[PDB]
Amino acid sequence: SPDYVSLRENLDIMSSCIVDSVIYKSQKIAGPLLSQISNLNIQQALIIRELLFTLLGHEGHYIQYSKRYDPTSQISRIEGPDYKIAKNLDISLKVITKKLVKFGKFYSGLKSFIQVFDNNKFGKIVQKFCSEVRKFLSSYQQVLINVEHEFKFNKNFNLNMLDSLLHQEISNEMTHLYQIGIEISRITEERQKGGLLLQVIQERMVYYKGDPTSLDFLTQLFDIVSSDYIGMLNQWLLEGVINDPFDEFMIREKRVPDSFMEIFQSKSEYYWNELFLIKIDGLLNQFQNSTI
Amino acid sequence: NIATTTKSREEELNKRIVNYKIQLKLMKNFLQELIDR
Amino acid sequence: REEELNKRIVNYKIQLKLMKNFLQELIDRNN
Amino acid sequence: LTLSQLIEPYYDTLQTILTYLPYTMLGSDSKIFTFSNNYTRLEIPKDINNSFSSLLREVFEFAILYKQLAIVVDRYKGTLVSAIKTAYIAILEAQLNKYVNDINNIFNNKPNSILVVYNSIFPWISILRFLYRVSNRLNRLDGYEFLTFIYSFTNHGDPKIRGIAVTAFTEVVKPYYNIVEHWIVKGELIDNNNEFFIIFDQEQNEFNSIIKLLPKKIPAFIKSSDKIFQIGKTLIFLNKYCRELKW
Amino acid sequence: TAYIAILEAQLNKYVNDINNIFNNKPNSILVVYNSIFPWISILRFLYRVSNRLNRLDGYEFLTFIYSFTNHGDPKIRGIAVTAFTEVVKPYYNIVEHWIVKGELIDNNNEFFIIFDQEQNEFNSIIKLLPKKIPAFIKSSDKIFQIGKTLIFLNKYCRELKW
Fold this sequence. Notes:
The structure is cut from a larger assembly and holds one copy of chain A (292 residues), two copies of chain B and two copies of chain D.
Chain A: E1 3-6, H1 40-54, E2 63-65, H2 74-79, E3 83-85, H3 91-117, H4 123-153, H5 159-169, H6 171-191, H7 197-205, H8 212-239, E4 251-253, H9 261-266, H10 268-274, E5 276-278
Antiparallel strand pairs in A: 2-3, 4-5
Helix pairs in contact in A: 1-3, 3-4, 3-5, 3-6, 4-8, 7-8
Chain B: H1 9-35
Chain D: H1 3-6, H2 16-25, E1 34-36, E2 41-44, H3 50-75, H4 83-108, H5 114-121, H6 125-135, H7 143-151, H8 159-185, E3 198-200, H9 207-210, E4 211-213, H10 225-240
Antiparallel strand pairs in D: 1-2, 3-4
Helix pairs in contact in D: 3-4, 3-5, 3-6, 4-8, 8-10
Subcellular location (chain D): Cytoplasm, Cytoskeleton, Microtubule organizing center
Domain Gamma tubulin complex component protein N-terminal (chain D): 19-247
Family (chain D): Belongs to the TUBGCP family.
């Protein structure tokens, strides 16, 4: 059977254009059985080769997606796929691989998060956060490329070195971003049955208040993400103009209906006293004061 | 007993109620003008 | 005695708030 | 021996990919990759095992999207009459030229693997997807609806998406400002198509009502429209009825 | 949390050390043992301290670690004084916020200054805890007055400019 890469048929401006929900039924090239191989070095090299692709979210010959992963469901894509390891691998290599597999899960989850939450209906805060996620992915692939180069040319490279390098380099930032993303997914699916990101970051930041590196990263992320909100507030307080039409800002100016234009023009008092409101949902604790 | 003071307590409350009766009636007239169209 | 005046004051506070909410509902629906 | 050597006997798959990959990336047929169905799908050959095929499916997104954009640019280069869409095509051509130069840089520096290629071109995912989405609606959208559609993206929070949207919007909006310039200075109407908030009525037989305004089509980025209309009307009146050409 | 952060750093160093010990293909078990021998005291100390991370409170933990900075053993005192810097930084951050702006940060009972919401007068809403004053802090009775006067200035007199 031929393999095809075909084009799939508030617009999603970053949703994948080609089809990516294709799951191969059986391997295009039949590789050697894992049980047949008895040497440890061969097994280690084979699992490393399969792991390089797994870390990017792809299947391998010896690491396969769990049957529970359904690409159709949104939550399944956001949470990332769960992998099962072939039963014939060595026990120590199986344990080490089970630790490293989680990194592919986070990467796939973030990549699918961008292709969903980066549209106009989710607001400037979430869009700007998707920008951070996409920059982090670009940085992470440079950690994977170096690993591949060392695997290809370094004789002393082994599985433990890969585990130590990945855990000591990229684990912390990836964990932070994935946790925030999955929490946003949980909250947004609850609300269907915007500015809430700042609340999630602040709630998240309480547990890492003593950790220097984690606190620095969370503070930097909060500072860059909030910059749009500060722009809206600055324009409102300096020029008295609301600009962004996403209804993100707390000071909700509302348009008079055309059917009542003549009425409201005569009674401008109600126009200037009723059609400006404060959206209490999106307020931070700083503004949670009547006089302010 | 509640302390007596030079400022008339009942006068203040009564003025508040009258000012709350003007706002209510003006709002009702405006809503009537809005609904009938 | 003045408890009664305070009670009426709060009742009219609620009534005014209801009227304003009615205005907001009507405007939201017309839009 | 390195790790990659010990696995060679036990792992079979077709550097050869990188030999024929640049020709596929530029939207051209290749010995091992062939387009079909009017360049809407790409067939990955046999002898490319699961992992490499899964990775290539991500890389080939750029090739197919770029081919579609090149088809659009080559097809509508000098056919469209509306100035707004023409300026959009001009900026699209500039962006595609930059993309081709980027690919040439990525493959001049002889790459070691598919992943370095993917990482090098990664920052172009949002630009290509946005351009493909906008160009997909170049037919049904009219001259002014297209301008309003692009204008709504200038407020996007994403620096990359908003950067490309505001880059394209400058050249897309320049022709509209040229229409306004001709109307303001000399007092004449240029747009043959319905893409402006001032129009004429040849059937009318009196000056004051031959020209009428369209309040629905007034753009958000224009200011003092009700004064532009009066300036243009008085200019027409002066230079065609009073025949005061000197002043 | 700061203690866990420094513990993670130490474990990362230990893993890198093991990777070095086995990258240089060892000849016997004894060379392996000798290579990692200097880590006996560090691991035992870290295990002993982490064993009491539950029962000990926020401040009792800080005082417990602080008592080891006086250990005579260069290795044990070295790790104790290495961990104590990052463990004590959050306490100094609480003191910094209290001294400069005049606000209380610690939601848990780990500081020698507290509030009383039930009280209905300024001078007695804030009270000191002489038992919880750490040994490494100085001029505590002046810190308290600086913080109280700042709260008074920026919330009652409303003199925000100065």
